[PDB]
Amino acid sequence: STDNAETGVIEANTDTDFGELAAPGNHTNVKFLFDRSRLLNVIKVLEKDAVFPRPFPTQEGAQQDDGYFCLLTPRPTVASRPATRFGLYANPSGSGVLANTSLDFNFYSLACFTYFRSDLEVTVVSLEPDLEFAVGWFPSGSEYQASSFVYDQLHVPFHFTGRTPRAFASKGGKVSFVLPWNSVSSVLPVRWGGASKLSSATRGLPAHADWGTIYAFVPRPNEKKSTAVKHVAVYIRYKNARAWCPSMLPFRSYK
Amino acid sequence: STDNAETGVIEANTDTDFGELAAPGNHTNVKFLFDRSRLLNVIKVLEKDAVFPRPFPTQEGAQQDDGYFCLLTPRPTVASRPATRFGLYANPSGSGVLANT
Amino acid sequence: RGNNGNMTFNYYANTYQNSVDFSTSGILNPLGYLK
Amino acid sequence: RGNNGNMTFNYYANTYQNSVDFSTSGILNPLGYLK
Amino acid sequence: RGNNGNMTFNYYANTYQNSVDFSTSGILNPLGYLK
Amino acid sequence: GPIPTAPRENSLMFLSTLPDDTVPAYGNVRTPPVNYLPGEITDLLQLARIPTLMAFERVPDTYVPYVAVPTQFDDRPLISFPITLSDPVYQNTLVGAISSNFANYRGCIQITLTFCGPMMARGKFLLSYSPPNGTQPQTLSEAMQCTYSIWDIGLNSSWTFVVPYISPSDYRETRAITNSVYSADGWFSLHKLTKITLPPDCPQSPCILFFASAGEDYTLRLPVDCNPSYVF
Amino acid sequence: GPIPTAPRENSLMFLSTLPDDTVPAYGNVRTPPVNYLPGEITDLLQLARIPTLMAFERVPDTYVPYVAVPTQFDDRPLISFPITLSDPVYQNTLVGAISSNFANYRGCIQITLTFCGPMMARGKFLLSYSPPNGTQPQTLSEAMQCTYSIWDIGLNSSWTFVVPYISPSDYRETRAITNSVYSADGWFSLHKLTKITLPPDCPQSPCILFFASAGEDYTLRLPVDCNPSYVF
Amino acid sequence: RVTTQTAGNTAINTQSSLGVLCAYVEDPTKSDPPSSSTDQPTTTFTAIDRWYTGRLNSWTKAVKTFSFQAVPLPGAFLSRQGGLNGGAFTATLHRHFLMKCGWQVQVQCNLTQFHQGALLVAMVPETTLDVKPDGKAKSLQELNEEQWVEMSDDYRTGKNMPFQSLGTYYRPPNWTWGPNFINPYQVTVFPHQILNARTSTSVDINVPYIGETPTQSSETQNSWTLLVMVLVPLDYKEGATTDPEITFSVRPTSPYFNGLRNRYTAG
């Protein structure tokens, strides 16, 4: 029919040309679609007080504990820090240390807007049989407390106690709870183009776009360290999500 | 602005000098802040009837069972008894008995 | 609203269940208007 | 109806418990009529 | 009041839940008055 | 006294899509208002209703989004493609991208065209839509019998062709594997009825742009998992 | 009969901040009344609103809480410090100590000054507040353009300077690590506009005392863990 | 099809026009002062309530499909790109810390009926194309040699945006994706208009203010970016006409300013 699509705003079934007005029969709603769990990352389990990674760039011969901790955000991250370029180690054995990375494939498969906001609901699942553990979390912009104290000649890491929530699960159990949107920024920028500092900043790297941080540890004294490593899984959900402006979608190769 | 802080009781935003009266947005309340768990102490577990520690000063060669029991108070304590000066054994191996605190 | 089935009883208070913004005191609109 | 005993309380909503068809807007009949 | 979420049902009696003192029969005040 | 109870057979289970809430851990937190941000989204159909561009293989990357009219033809449509949403031509359009993440769809697809060439040219085109058959129709004589329409170059250079929805079932699958009647729904083709008259001093070979979107009665039903292939 | 039930996925869990009560063990106990004790506290902001003193490095412990005016100057403020609550100068003030245990703050800081010297002296001072910039302003000419005020020695020896709150976000972080725009908020400085006239027989070099506190619209949001460093 | 819009002491004329696209909401002009600060703000006045004009590179047959050029806003004012000179607006910008404003632009071309081709212009929000992959803004001298940006798989995948080097401690990963890809086939989602060679000459858009905070820093914000891309390569009969030119005009709307200070300086 007559129209002018160069103007952009085109008009708007078969009743117009030849109709059929098939009756309705809301599964695409933003609030409904995003309410379901999905894996985020897999992390080790602590057995003593750890040293948080230093900010980049990290020089050779720097002592720290890497592989633990994990942010709560869909945007790409590296070494438990915000990042922009997603990457992976597809190459064979090399040298140095390998940096853990994460990303929300399912979220970005339909991330067709710019700004987002919702509540987060976290849960944790163990992997090794009959494993006992616990979880700890702190808000954005805070810091992880190091060092340990002595009780009856046993070194208890400080992270056993704090004003932030703690969770103890029975042998072979699971954890779950819901946290509030606590970042300073009003909404989460899916893609950004600003700078966080007046000088020496990196374009397009947001500062406090997340929900917090999480870690896992065993309720034992530091005098009972073991050798075999342990692992833990993490899942997240979104509650009352909202979107605020259109955007693009990931490109699909034509190979 | 004009004031006299030597008197102690000073008066009381930007509306007074240049304002801004940002609207409210009670996380500091006494009742709310102090309601959350925190570790207090770590103690051994008995396996028989024990002898309670004797009051200070305890002379050398006194038979008792130490390291168990624990008070319920935020104030510093030593050997499961009220105390004033908080202390810790940062020194290496020594002698005698080490007092839980 | 949302993928929530329960419609009989909410135990915890709304303020402790969901965040709330502090006051400062079918039919689908189109995202483009052409005057 | 059916092999269902509970008759006091249904927790989840009907829409989330059973499927529903969308609108398009003793005595036993015999399966054969002979005019 | 306090970090308490439940607002529907208290099982145990108040006297057995919290201590009570026996009878002997926003807006914030300032802790200093200067006559 | 204690209330008798009987735990069921599925206790201590974890479901990734259970419609229920969880206990709060750090509640009683306020947030800044967001009434200043305009353009809030409510349903992804709003974005699905927006036109976008298609792709084509081009002669022997080469995936230009337009088709160029040749000079001499041979009893064959200029371009034709199936109506299966898993087809390559629908890959990058918003409708195809969104639908690929759902199982069932329902409604009428919408196709829009636009001409790009010298103003003082003339011509006539024919658009066709053939439901499923044993063999894809090729000749203009065959094409004419099926549903069709005639497009005439004039003041307005754009035209919209609405594909009717006919199928033996209320819903239809979104991706085709066996090409059963439940997924495939025929073909679409473009035929040059006349010969385009290029005015003097206008060099040659105009081009046509394809615009596709969703109709006003589109719908999707069942969510599914995604393909993370785009990360590699 | 028994009531059917289904325990959830997070049974037998222990939360250190769960908003719920526990079963009593030794209830039904009375306590003496406390109506005789005056001065009950309700919110820590009441204590946060009280002035206190600051610290300064002094020339090469040396952390006197006052600044002494020199005789000859050189185009530079007498003292300047950032507006980051993690700065050393804010360590022992009540506002800094309390805020260090919370994540986000909001409101207007308050600064108060007082003069200590001979009665019959005279002078004039200038106070400045510079929002974030590429370089900290130094000269009086620069300082004058920004927000400022002039203090004159007279009958009243005390003055209060209110720091306005301007930021791109509703809330701000309390401790700075990267010095991002979300934590740092510029600098404060003091400049001697004139030369202080010491009356005869009054020896020299008066002193100034710094008083800091919280404004009337201060606020803190998120509790956090503490630092036990003070025990060592 | 003939209308003129007057603002301040300057005006613009349109021999052909379809209308004005109003973007997300009706009446983008309406706005309110921010809420993340108390100091009284500065508002609009006649000195800044007017248009501004600039120039772009020429269009040549050699250009292929999907090539593009970008002009960040308001960073164009600061960089003086394309000869644009904000004057009073730039002077006021350099003397403030917080800003909030809308935008309203129009682009014109001199295509004649004896040419074939198409152009697409859209206001892509929250993008970074000006910066080189190294992590430094593209200089005015560098922007001249290359007149149009060449589309490539790297840009399509967003694999070459600025990043942070990890350091010798780690091993270098293989970068393959980023959240700022460019998808040419879907650019029409943002407000846009097709600048065909046979239908019109001037296009225009109206956009409101957006951002993840009620106000953004005035020295780094890059909310809106103007993008021009070529769909149908230019072609014409030899000897008729050569390489048309391009121009554009800008005008802010209902701005606000906060945080006065001296002139911005770096180091």
Residues 1-30 of F with CB under 8 A from G: 3-8, 10-15, 20, 22-27, 29-30
Extract the tokens encoding A144. 């992880």
Tell me whether residues H164 and A189 touch, CB distance under 8 A: no
Tell me whether residues A62 and H222 touch, CB distance under 8 A: no
Q: Which residue of G has its CA nearest to H215?
A: G168
Which amino acid is residue A17, in one-letter code? Answer: D
The answer to whether F and G touch (≥3 CB pairs < 8 Å) is yes
Q: Which residue of H has its CA nearest to C34?
A: H21
Helix (H, G, I), strand (E, B) or coil at F155: coil
H180 Cβ under 8 Å from any chain B Cβ: no
Distance, in Å, from the CA atom of H225 to the CA atom of H75, rounded to the nearest integer, reads 9
Chain B nearest CA to C15, separation (Å): 13
Total domains present in chain A: 1
Resolution in A: 3.4
Residues 15-74 of F with CB under 8 A from E: 24, 27-28
Chain A nearest CA to B7, separation (Å): 39
DSSP 8-class letter at H254: S
Give the closest of E3, E26, E32 to B35, CB-based. E3
Contact H2, H15 (CB under 8 A): yes
Chain E nearest CA to C9, separation (Å): 10
Q: Which subunits sit against B, judged by 3+ Cβ pairs under 8 A?
A: A, C, E, F, G, H
Q: Which of G3, G9, G15, G172 best tests the F interface by mutation, with the highest count of F CBs <10 A? A: G9
Q: Which of G78, G56, G39 is nearest to G212 (CA)?
A: G56
Helix (H, G, I), strand (E, B) or coil at C34: strand
Extract the tokens encoding H64. 């292929």
> SS3 sequence, F92-121?
CCHHHHHHCCECEEECCEEEEEEEECCCCC
Chain E positions touching F28 (Cβ under 8 A) are 3
Chain E positions touching C11 (Cβ under 8 A) are 5-6, 8
Q: Which subunits sit against A, judged by 3+ Cβ pairs under 8 A?
A: B, C, D, F, G, H
Q: Is the dihedral of CA H124, H127, H130, H133 positive or negative?
A: negative
Extract the tokens encoding D35. 């005019």
Q: Which of H173, H135, H169, G179 is nearest to A57 (CA)?
A: H169
Q: What count of other Cβ atoms lies within 10 Å of the Cβ of residue G167?
A: 26
What is the CATH classification number for the domain harbouring F109? 2.60.120.20
Distance, in Å, from the CA atom of H124 to the CA atom of H72, rounded to the nearest integer, reads 10
Task: List beta partners, residue H42.
Answer: H257
Q: Which residue of B has its CA nearest to C22?
A: B25
Residues 125-184 of H with CB under 8 A from C: none
Q: Which of G15, F14, F8 is nearest to A126 (CA)?
A: F14
Which amino acid is residue F68, in one-letter code? Answer: A
Give the closest of G23, G30, G39 to E21, CB-based. G30
Which amino acid is residue H74, in one-letter code? Answer: P
Chain A nearest CA to B36, separation (Å): 7
F28 Cβ under 8 Å from any chain B Cβ: yes
Chain F nearest CA to G93, separation (Å): 27
Q: Which subunits sit against F, judged by 3+ Cβ pairs under 8 A?
A: A, B, C, E, G, H
Extract the tokens encoding H122. 């859209």
Chain mean position to CA H123 = 7
B36 Cβ under 8 Å from any chain G Cβ: yes
Which residue range(s) make up the domain with F223?
1-232
> SS3 sequence, F47-82?
HHCCCEECCCCCCCCCCCCEEECCCCCCCCCCEEEE
Is residue G19 reached through a cis peptide bond, with omega within 30 degrees of 0 on the bond before it? no
Which residue range(s) make up the domain with A137?
1-255
- End-to-end Cα separation, chain C, in angstroms: 35
Tell me whether residues C21 and F33 touch, CB distance under 8 A: yes
Total domains present in chain G: 1
Give, in order, the Cα–Cα distances in Å from A158 to each of A130, B40, B41, B67, G86: 25, 12, 12, 21, 22
Radius of gyration of chain G (CA): 25
Chain B positions touching E3 (Cβ under 8 A) are 32, 35-36
Q: Which of A137, A151, A164, A223 best tests the B interface by mutation, with the highest count of B CBs <10 A? A: A151
Helix (H, G, I), strand (E, B) or coil at F175: coil
Chain A positions touching C26 (Cβ under 8 A) are 24
Give the closest of H39, H259, H264 to G134, CB-based. H264
F141 Cβ under 8 Å from any chain B Cβ: no
Burial code (b: 16+ CB inside 10 Å, e: under 16) for B66-94 equals bbebeeeeeeebebbeeeeeeeeeeeeee
Give the closest of A166, A174, A198 to G132, CB-based. A198
Chain mean position to CA F44 = 14
Chain H positions touching A201 (Cβ under 8 A) are 220
> SS3 sequence, chain A?
CEECHHHCCCCCCHHHHCCCCCCCCCCCEHHHHCCCCEEEEEEECECCCCCCCCCCCCCCCCCCCCCCCEECCCCCEECCEECCCEEECCCCCCCCECCCEECCHHHHHCCCECEEEEEEEEEEEECCCCCCCEEEEECCCCCCCCCEEEECCEEEEHHHCCCCCEEECCCCCCEEEEECCCCCCCCEECCCCCCCCCCCCCCCCCCCCCCCEEEEECCCCHHHCCCCCCEEEEEEEEEEEEECCECCCCCCCCC
Chain mean position to CA G1 = 64
Extract the tokens encoding A212. 């917090």
Tell me whether residues C31 and H24 touch, CB distance under 8 A: yes
Residues 1-35 of C with CB under 8 A from H: 24, 31-35
Which amino acid is residue H180, in one-letter code? Answer: N
**DSSP H or E stretch at residue C15:** helix C14-17
Task: List beta partners, residue A231.
Answer: A44
Chain F nearest CA to G44, separation (Å): 18
Distance, in Å, from the CA atom of G3 to the CA atom of G9, rounded to the nearest integer, reads 19
What is the CATH classification number for the domain harbouring A108? 2.60.120.20
Chain B positions touching E26 (Cβ under 8 A) are 24
Q: How many CA atoms lie within 13 A of F203 on its CB side?
A: 14
Helix, strand, coil % over all residues of chain B, rounded to 5: 5, 5, 85
Chain mean position to CA F151 = 21
Helix (H, G, I), strand (E, B) or coil at H153: helix
Tell me whether residues E31 and G24 touch, CB distance under 8 A: no
Q: Which of G147, G217, G224, G231 best tests the B interface by mutation, with the highest count of B CBs <10 A? A: G217
Contact B23, C24 (CB under 8 A): yes
Chain A positions touching D23 (Cβ under 8 A) are 23
Chain D positions touching A25 (Cβ under 8 A) are 22
Helix (H, G, I), strand (E, B) or coil at G124: strand
Q: Which subunits sit against C, judged by 3+ Cβ pairs under 8 A?
A: A, B, D, E, F, H
Give the closest of A154, A162, A166 to B42, CB-based. A154
Tell me whether residues C33 and H21 touch, CB distance under 8 A: yes
The vertex-A231 CA angle with A229 and A236, nearest 5°, equals 165
